[PDB]
């Protein structure tokens, strides 16, 4: 057994981190490997993760974080049986991947505009609450060439598009992803889509 | 009823003051009375984050800055439209509130903006007249003030 590429991890900055790594040869991740992780701190407890196969020689491990702050630093130990293969560190605040928004709904209140609203994926108790800027993606079901990405740079999770920039009689679909500039995060996965057919 | 204004002076309305549990714990004199309406202090007589007693109060929760100035507008993209402004106090202490509407709107719609972010409209109707105005608040990383500043001078965009 040998480590091909080094384990890289991402965090949602709330509860779950995820780590991926490729192996030398094909391996049964659940049978051969164990991943120990623990928060470097006075009061902390060690945790063990069972890897899942993602491919032939690619293992993935879901990590459990009760609470994450920016200073938190975790020690990762990759074990094959009783012989260490790889050791490393992981600061979740430096590898954040936010949770996707949801509760995406279409409001036809105003006749001059079309209101889109979604739910901020984090509770107000989370540090990422007032740092999430979103990006709404709208596309036409009839004209695939109509594929727009609006950038929402204010704190509220809503979007008002001019009703004149939409065409009458065709149905559009929308989805929204989120990112936090303050923490230099990657993008969240696209939310599930909503559909509407305006006339 | 004291209020600090953009880290410049203070206005109290309806004496002597001293800094509680810190250096320079001598009672001073109101150099400039207000008509007796109240008192006023200079920028050197103001030490934020110091237990200010005259009636005791915290100073960083009583700051009211100036309204923003130099409001600009320019399209960041084919559909984007970014609004800029300038502030007198430290830009890393202010929480801005942007408010806009059209000439057909019967009510203002507003969105909040962080200090590190810049406001922008992702979608704009080119055949409508827009009007923007911004006010700021000294909150929440440098203080816990609940009062905003005055609305800046409005800016306009578009035709029809």
């Amino acid at each position, epitope marked *: 057994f040998k480590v091909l590429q080094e384990p890289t991890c991402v965090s949602d900055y709330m509860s779950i981190s995820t780590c991926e790594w490729k192996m030398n040869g094909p391996t049964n991740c659940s049978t051969e490997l164990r991943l120990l992780y623990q928060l470097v701190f006075l009061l902390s407890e060690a945790h063990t993760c069972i890897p899942e196969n993602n491919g032939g020689a690619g293992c993935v491990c879901h990590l459990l974080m009760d609470d994450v702050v920016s200073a938190d630093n975790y020690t990762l130990d990759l074990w094959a049986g009783q012989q260490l293969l790889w050791k490393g560190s992981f600061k979740p605040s430096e590898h954040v991947k936010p949770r996707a928004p949801g509760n995406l709904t279409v409001h036809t209140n105003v006749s001059d505009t079309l209101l889109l609203t979604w739910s901020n994926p984090y509770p107000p108790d989370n540090y990422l609450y007032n740092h999430l800027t979103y990006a709404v993606n709208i596309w036409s079901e009839n004209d*695939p*060439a109509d594929f*727009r990405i609006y950038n929402v740079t204010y704190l509220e999770p809503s979007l008002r598009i001019a009703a004149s920039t939409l065409k009458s009689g065709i149905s559009y679909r929308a989805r929204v992803r989120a990112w936090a500039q303050c923490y230099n995060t990657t993008w969240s996965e696209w939310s599930p889509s909503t559909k509407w057919h305006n006339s | 009823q004291c209020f600090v204004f953009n880290v410049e002076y203070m206005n109290c309305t309806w004496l002597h003051y001293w800094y509680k549990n810190s250096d320079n714990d001598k009672v001073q004199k109101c150099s400039h009375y207000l008509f007796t309406s109240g008192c006023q202090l200079q920028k050197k007589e103001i030490h934020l984050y110091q237990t200010f007693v005259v009636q005791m109060l915290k100073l960083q929760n009583l700051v009211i800055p100036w309204a923003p100035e130099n409001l600009t507008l320019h*399209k960041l993209s*084919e559909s984007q439209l970014e609004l800029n402004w300038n502030n007198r106090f430290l830009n890393h202490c202010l929480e801005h509130l942007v408010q806009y509407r059209t000439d057909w709107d019967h009510s203002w719609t507003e969105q909040s903006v962080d200090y590190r972010h810049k406001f922008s409209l992702p979608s704009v109707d*080119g*055949q409508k007249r827009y009007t923007f105005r911004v006010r700021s608040r000294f909150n929440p990383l440098c203080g816990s003030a609940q009062h905003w500043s005055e609305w800046s001078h409005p800016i306009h965009w578009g*035709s*029809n």
Partner: antibody, heavy 122, light 108 residues
Framework: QVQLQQSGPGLVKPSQTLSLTCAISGDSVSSNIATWNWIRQSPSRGLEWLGR?????????DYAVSVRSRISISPDTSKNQFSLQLNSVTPEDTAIYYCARFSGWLGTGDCWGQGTLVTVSS | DIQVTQSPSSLSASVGDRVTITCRAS??????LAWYQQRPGKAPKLLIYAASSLETGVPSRFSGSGSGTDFTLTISSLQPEDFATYYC?????????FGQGTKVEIKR
């Protein structure tokens, strides 16, 4: 910033095939927010739209009726290019040919190529 | 097929005048109309999209108005560099159809 470089002008014998290419800088041919078009201009035709190719979840092609029976527009994601081909050309196909980046959702040419004059003559 | 007819063929106006070019569509196309400028020897340049919105870097003296089938491009305070041919184009559906052009000549 986007920059579009076209192939050189030249001669094409009648009933042969016209082929032009467009080199894209500052954008991707496989961009899903844009569409890549070919337009020709001449007195007998005016400003005539030929067709477009664009990528969303797969490649799409759209042509004009006047040239659909003779036209083919193809992307080149290794050299970041796209090309136009017209076969069975007549002297009526003599014109100035532009490539252009049209915005996908509002169908408008943001960026155009300098233009290539193709002459059809024996 | 959305057809588009532009008028007039040509016009001469002095520096500072208010030039107006019109464009009539075959069907209702809401506000999906664009305006281009072609200076001599150069490719067309986008001026106005979505009937009324100025492309960045285009001087503020260019105006677009109209909705439905009748649209209008307006140049206030005509300038010597505004000498070109102006094309409209419906952006509603493919195939894109352009106007016949309008040669704006400067009168000095």
């Amino acid at each position: 910033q986007v920059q579009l470089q076209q192939s050189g002008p030249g001669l094409v014998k009648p009933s042969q095939t016209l082929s032009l290419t467009c080199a894209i800088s500052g954008d991707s041919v496989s961009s899903n927010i844009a569409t890549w078009n070919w337009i020709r201009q001449s007195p007998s035709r005016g400003l005539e739209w030929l067709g477009r190719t664009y990528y969303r979840s797969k490649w799409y092609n759209d042509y004009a009726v006047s040239v659909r029976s003779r036209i083919s527009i193809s992307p080149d994601t290794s050299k970041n290019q796209f090309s136009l081909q017209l076969n069975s050309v007549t002297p009526e196909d003599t014109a100035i040919y532009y490539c252009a980046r049209f915005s996908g959702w509002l169908g408008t040419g943001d960026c155009w190529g300098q233009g290539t004059l193709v002459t059809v003559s024996s | 097929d959305i057809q588009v007819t532009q008028s007039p063929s040509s016009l001469s106006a002095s520096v500072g005048d208010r030039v107006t070019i019109t464009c009539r569509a075959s069907q209702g196309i809401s506000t999906w109309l664009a305006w281009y400028q072609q200076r001599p020897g150069k490719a067309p340049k986008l001026l106005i999209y979505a009937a009324s919105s100025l492309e960045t870097g285009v001087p503020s003296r260019f105006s677009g108005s109209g909705s439905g089938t009748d649209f209008t491009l307006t140049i206030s305070s005509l300038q010597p560099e505004d000498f070109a041919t102006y094309y409209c184009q419906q952006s509603y559906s493919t195939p894109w159809t352009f106007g016949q052009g309008t040669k704006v000549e400067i009168k000095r």
